[PDB]
Amino acid sequence: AAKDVKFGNDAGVKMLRGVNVLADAVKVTLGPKGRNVVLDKSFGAPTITKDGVSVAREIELEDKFENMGAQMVKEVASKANDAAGDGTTTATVLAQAIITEGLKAVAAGMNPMDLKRGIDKAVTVAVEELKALSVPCSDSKAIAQVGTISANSDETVGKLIAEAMDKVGKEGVITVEDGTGLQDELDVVEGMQFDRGYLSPYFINKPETGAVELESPFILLADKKISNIREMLPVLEAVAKAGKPLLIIAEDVEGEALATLVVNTMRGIVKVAAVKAPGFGDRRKAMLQDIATLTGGTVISEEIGMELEKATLEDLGQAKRVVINKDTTTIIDGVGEEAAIQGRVAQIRQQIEEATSDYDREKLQERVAKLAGGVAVIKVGAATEVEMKEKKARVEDALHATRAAVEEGVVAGGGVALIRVASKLADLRGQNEDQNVGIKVALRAMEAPLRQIVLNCGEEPSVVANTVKGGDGNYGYNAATEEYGNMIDMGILDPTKVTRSALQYAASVAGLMITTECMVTDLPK
Amino acid sequence: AAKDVKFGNDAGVKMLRGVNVLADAVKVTLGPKGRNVVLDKSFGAPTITKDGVSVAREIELEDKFENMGAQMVKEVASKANDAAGDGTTTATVLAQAIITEGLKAVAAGMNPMDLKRGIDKAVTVAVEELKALSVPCSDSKAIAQVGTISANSDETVGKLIAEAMDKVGKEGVITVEDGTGLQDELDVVEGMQFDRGYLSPYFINKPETGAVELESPFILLADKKISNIREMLPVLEAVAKAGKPLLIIAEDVEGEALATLVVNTMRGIVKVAAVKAPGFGDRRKAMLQDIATLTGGTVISEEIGMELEKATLEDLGQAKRVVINKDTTTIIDGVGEEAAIQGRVAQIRQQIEEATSDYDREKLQERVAKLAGGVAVIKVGAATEVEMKEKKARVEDALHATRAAVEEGVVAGGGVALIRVASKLADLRGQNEDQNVGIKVALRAMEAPLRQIVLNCGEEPSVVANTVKGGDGNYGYNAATEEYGNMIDMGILDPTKVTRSALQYAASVAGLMITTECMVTDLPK
Amino acid sequence: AAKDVKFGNDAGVKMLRGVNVLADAVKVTLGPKGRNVVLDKSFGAPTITKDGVSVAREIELEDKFENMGAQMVKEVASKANDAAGDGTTTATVLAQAIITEGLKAVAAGMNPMDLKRGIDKAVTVAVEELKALSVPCSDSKAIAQVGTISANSDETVGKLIAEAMDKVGKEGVITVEDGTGLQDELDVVEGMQFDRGYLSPYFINKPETGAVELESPFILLADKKISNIREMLPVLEAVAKAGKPLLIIAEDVEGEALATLVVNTMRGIVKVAAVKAPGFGDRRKAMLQDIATLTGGTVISEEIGMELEKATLEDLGQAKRVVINKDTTTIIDGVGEEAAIQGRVAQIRQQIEEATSDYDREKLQERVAKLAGGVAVIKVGAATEVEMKEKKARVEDALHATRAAVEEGVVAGGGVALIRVASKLADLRGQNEDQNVGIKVALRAMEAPLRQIVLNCGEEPSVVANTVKGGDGNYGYNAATEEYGNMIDMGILDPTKVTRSALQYAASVAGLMITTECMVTDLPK
């Protein structure tokens, strides 16, 4: 259709207005004193939230160009979310800060490309510096603290997460479900859990959790790669009857075969999901067997001259339920008999005795623990369905944040880490003045998170910012108590990963907008 | 419906306005300092590009007449693209330059036909002169340089392309696919690859790549032309069963038979694709056999009194996958047994020994290399899906440009080649004054590319243009470093083919517009 | 619906405005210096043409009455086109000239009927006078010249046409197809070709060429007229099987039978086309046999007591392909065996020996030549698909014009023939003054073609017209070189047939408009 086309400044003011509406709506929810945002619903009462992502999803503007600016920066939160699962609001205020000053510099006549280069250089060095300052979240105490902090100071949620990770390990699978009513519940189910997700989406039958769930399915344990569907045809049909879904746990399911499975299960033609076998090399085969012993199946390896074509429903393993995430497979309640299973345990138990290497020893103990990984399930307390659904949300977020914290060290929260980094880069320079302005734009935007947190408290941003910059190290402002102190000692930490991600995605989208010269959209008609 | 009709000047100003909107939007993306253009999307964030073609595709104007002018010049980029696969932006700025001055001359009262004749004469001589200045891109170093330059100075992409061409030859087939994650991968697959594309589109089942892809298909190796479908009927039905696609590799598939295949495979009635046999004359038969030995098929030649009717699925060859472009067929992983294949190699290996001619020797070595051409596959590095998808784009373009460079010599880039050519034509004259003005219009437009590249840098076009014209030879302006020097020594080259194409298509469309007296379009209703 | 009704002058000015828009758009394309007209397309770039018919097809006006005038005169071009296949633009400028002055005379109070009578008388005498001046286009040199002139001075196209007519005779069938690429190709295919077209349209399966094309069809050779479908029923069903089309070559297919064939083949119920047998009388039977010997069929004549009912697929002849125009049937590649065919040739070859009459001798040689007419196929050169498609158009038009030239003598081109004729009619008078004005209107309009050709050159119409009228004979203005001279010696000729047709259709439609008193059209609602 006929288009409306805008250039330079005309386009810039439109974009800026669009990012401001989005960022302003989102940033009021930042930190312990975040404010509420009410989102209208077509039916019933409006939604009241302090969740940034929830607000962003609702933002769409009337002016086509302003809407483009809003949808562009909205990409910042979504990418930061996909990558770290937290810090989307932080990423959004960093982006607004960089875009605002960057566009001002452009309007002033500065070279957009140089501005972007300067911003990029500052971010590159800032990230290195962020790593240098990064400390860990390994022990259960740290995990508890981060969990508590991520749960709005709810020490309860903190303990839960810590206990759940103590059961299945901090790398294990953990889920949260509605509670039976009052008092939380934590139980490990099959069963076993290993680090391997679906070999492709679509298998996802429950987009609510973005996971795949199968009930009383058959489990094919093939010790090899599967490229040709032909091999599956015989077993797939055997499973076609008995009306039960099939879980493929092979060394890997490549294009040809995988593509077919995706299409067939897409047409209701037999429900089948595929995931890679745990581990690699030798231990892979040994582990693929542990699953067999657990599900009562039989490994189909070519090493013993076995063919998938010559595989009956008797070779297949089976369990009451199996769940698979983007990167986790959990088999709940397997058919395997305690005789075989417990016997398998005894075997591996001796393996540990004959262990001549710590590495081999560790790997073996990992198997016995799993067989004797599973899935830790957290059932949220209650006392009224409303509160129960709420606490469930908090536990979910706290878990998500703590998981991120465990993966990559931690740094002082409350926006102080970025402020310390910015101060260390005061002498950073580029190839020219415009690049230097870009560097300064980035260092200035690095104070935005702390300033917005303070602003949401009802305090003065410049005063608090000035005071924090005055000290050093982990010295920061505790917005919950409105007292200065050592952020680490007060338990206010952020996973280095979310801080880094927030900054990189903010600078990335900001750089693109700053170097945008023209915009095209449908004519308002 | 009722039409709006415009004549002369009224039509001219409309056309000019339409080409200006398109050219201005496109030309800002020219060269190393090209600016970004933001293209609106109905959903999500806007597209940000420095790619001229991407911008042109989005240009459509409200005023019916202006839109006609935009769509007309848009033909310049598309034809230059189809012919050389690069230089569409260059072609667009040349067209705008020729159209602008040409229409001004017309408004001044000059004869349109003479103006066009003059422009044509200048372009004819300019092309001859361009050939005279043309130098080569034969060795891997040159290929690497061009690749690097086409990849925005990414020496990585440069090395990749150079290595890929070193594997399958600079005339061989090369593809790029998403990487497994971090670090690039280069592997040659079946298999073999020969220079023959689909005998007609439609066979193209994947318009994304504009190629045809078949999985585990049967390969009919007929040593003769196929005109009558009757001959195929028996084999086509044999292939109808077993549910596998068919690849026809005959001496040629003419109208009657071809037309049927296009219609049938068009109705899902058996998937079949046809391509000519590699080479011609004697070597053709020998090569058609190499394919047989590779795919485990049997050549059906009339020389041995064989009929296609009397051909079973046992005579047909077979491979896990085959891909065919506009002019390349690649058979990946053939059923042929290493015994037969490796034996065939030994045969041809002796052929080379008994070779009494270099030509026959070269041709034989070509066969052994292919059997012992295939398809080089480039898997782009990664480190996040976003960057991976981006680098993939660059490798694709760099490859496309380097391929063009390899085909036809090279000339100084940065728009200097056309400037040198223009200076050599200062004394060119026509049959009259109007023809002389046309010649001058063309020589003036030849400076436009260098001027726009400089303008995009933020420098002064006239000053740089003046300085480059001041020197001679490969003396030019390096827009990346903003330093003058020897364009060739700095590695800034353009395939003579893209420069020539850009100029000819620009002059061609410009000539048509300049000689347009009337425009007809639907009434804005 | 409610109508708008206009009378006399009100209607006249509307008509005149409508013919002026159409004629003005069309006439700029007249002659060697014709200008371009740009025609808008709903998708892609506009069409740029110098072809009058192409422009006329696009002309439709908003004002209902003006549109009526445009559509009426548009009938001039279309009829001239159908009758001579050239001179549509010439016919259009003659019509505008006659209509313009004629309507002015009417407005002045002159009797419309007398004006029309005068115009008619002038045209009647002018045509006689045109015949008197008419010279021939018989030898290949003349054919080459006309072809070159009709191909915009492209001596290449001229040679092609000349060679094609040298192969199949100037009365033979000639077609043009896309070339294989670079360099033209001329080959005679079956086969044989005779002067007989489809016995009715509808059989036309390819409206693009307005011809009928059959592949591997059966050929019924009945030596008699076919009125009753009953006779065909048995053979039609035999042909229903084997899934092959049928070509009926009988003495003639009359109403009843023909009507059925048209209806059945109209419903996909068996594809059958019918054409009369070549020649008449005795030679007819002999010729019908030559076709049999060529297609391997059997003539079904009642003379030998044969019935169509008792005719099997074995009696029917057969060929790989057959094409039939409005007045030409060409059988390509017949099944007949070279033994029978070459033997038949020997027979007729002796016939020529025993020939006691030149007439019988000529007729026999015609048969041997055909059997030892066919269809000459011209494959246009190339060097890029665009240029190839263009040159193909030129060859098509040049062929069409040359064919017309060959049929009926030639006269000086460049509009001089009509000017010479007009000068010879200076003393022509009618029954009254109004009739005399009508005569003058017609003689004045006869200068219009030369004047428009000159005007398109950018020269002065009155000066050139005055100078040409000053000399005599073939003295004219060469618009290509802008030099006066002998039109015939310069090779600028027009078939007398197209000039005559252009004038008669122009005067015919003009006469109708001039005698129109009232117009009725739907109310603009």
Ligand SMILES: Nc1ncnc2c1ncn2[C@@H]1O[C@H](COP(=O)(O)OP(=O)(O)OP(=O)(O)O)[C@@H](O)[C@H]1O
């Ligand atoms: N007591 C506190 N004092 C100061 N800052 C705190 C305190 N508790 C938490 N924070 C900080 O608040 C920030 C996180 O706030 P919040 O969860 O509202 O936004 P986000 O994580 O950036 O985005 P999302 O909407 O995805 O949660 C981090 O900088 C965190 O360290």
Ligand SMILES: Nc1ncnc2c1ncn2[C@@H]1O[C@H](COP(=O)(O)OP(=O)(O)OP(=O)(O)O)[C@@H](O)[C@H]1O
């Ligand atoms: N360092 C450089 N200095 C000057 N010119 C350069 C430099 N590097 C590349 N170029 C030139 O830039 C031009 C190519 O730019 P670009 O790829 O943006 O446009 P294009 O090829 O004309 O069209 P497309 O949009 O199809 O790519 C060529 O003239 C090339 O030689």
Ligand SMILES: Nc1ncnc2c1ncn2[C@@H]1O[C@H](COP(=O)(O)OP(=O)(O)OP(=O)(O)O)[C@@H](O)[C@H]1O
């Ligand atoms: N060198 C020439 N000088 C003068 N007149 C020429 C010359 N070459 C061709 N002509 C004339 O130009 C006329 C034909 O022009 P043109 O083909 O443009 O129009 P047309 O045949 O009247 O209509 P159509 O659009 O059907 O072709 C004829 O009168 C022909 O003799």
Ligand SMILES: [K+]
């Ligand atoms: K919040």
Ligand SMILES: [K+]
């Ligand atoms: K570019």
Ligand SMILES: [K+]
């Ligand atoms: K013309």
Ligand SMILES: [Mg+2]
């Ligand atoms: Mg958070």
Ligand SMILES: [Mg+2]
């Ligand atoms: Mg390019």
Ligand SMILES: [Mg+2]
């Ligand atoms: Mg003509």
